Amino acid sequence: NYSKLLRNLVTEDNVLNEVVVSFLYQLFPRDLFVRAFSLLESADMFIYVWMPTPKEADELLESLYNGTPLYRPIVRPRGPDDRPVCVDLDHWFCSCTEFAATCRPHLVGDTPLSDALFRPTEAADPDDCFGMLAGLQHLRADPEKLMCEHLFAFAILLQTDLRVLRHFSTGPGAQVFVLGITSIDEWLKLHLNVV
Amino acid sequence: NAERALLQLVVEDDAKALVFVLGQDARRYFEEELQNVGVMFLDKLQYLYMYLTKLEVDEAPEYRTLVVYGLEQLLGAGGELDADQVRLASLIYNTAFRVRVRHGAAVRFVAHGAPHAQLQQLEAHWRLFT
Ligand SMILES: [Mg+2]
Ligand SMILES: [Zn+2]
């Protein structure tokens, strides 16, 4: 579903599919794709992977699709008056204000939050990883009801195909940065301004 | 009632648990009405977020249980939650339960005084992922 659509962003020869891009503007609400695509080329997106033992660079990017790394998708501040945004795809969480503003109205007594923001999993195809939730087999995130550009941008990178992640994070046109972290102090430092 | 039970866990000291006492009000209660049980007093949520983060990246599980006592106080929860409070509360919930995913430790939230209904709703949502 979502994954199969967005997977086509990058051709088999690692080229950006301009036809698909043009269609994605018309296929998503709230200008979500132009917003997400601006983030992808901003150079502010980072994926910090906890790497106590040095790993091959390819093993890092590949581990994001097939392994179980402890990683931290973060959007860097763009100005002095800014704090990092962190995403937790597996929990469909984002520390940005839009995420919290969307959920707030749905906080009522005696109502699952997921009932107001998530969708059932039955209809969805087996190979569509987009919005898949760790733990919850029967529910998936519903991008129509809740999705900011940060979640969209990172889901595009991490819930489509390794080819998509390699395209935005390697080569000359690299605007996304996957970096292994080998020290606890550097890992803690990443979070110091999130709150 | 929950508070007293938490006090009892603290006094007995048998369990491998970490208690986070949040806020001046919660600190006073602990002192006024009171080793495998760690107790830590924090008057800023930044501290709790950083410590949960550290617990996640540490290689070995150290505690079977993590108790967070006083979240309402440090959020400044009075009346219904605003967007900023939902953000902070969700960051704490997601980080706390990330420790459970990493190391398989129980995560419990105890309220000092009356618990906030909306914070209870947010906690229930994150627990579904564990
Ligand atoms: Mg573990
Ligand atoms: Zn966001």
From Swiss-Prot, chain A:
Keywords: DNA damage, DNA recombination, DNA repair, Nucleus. Signal peptide: none annotated. One of its GO terms (cellular component) is nucleus. It is found in: Nucleus. One of its GO terms (biological process) is DNA repair. Coiled coil: none annotated. Plays a role in a RAD51/RAD54-dependent homologous recombination repair (HRR) pathway to repair MMS-induced lesions during S-phase. Required for error-free repair of spontaneous and induced DNA lesions to protect the genome from mutation. Belongs to the SHU2 family. This is Suppressor of hydroxyurea sensitivity protein 2. It comes from Eremothecium gossypii (strain ATCC 10895 / CBS 109.51 / FGSC 9923 / NRRL Y-1056) (Yeast).
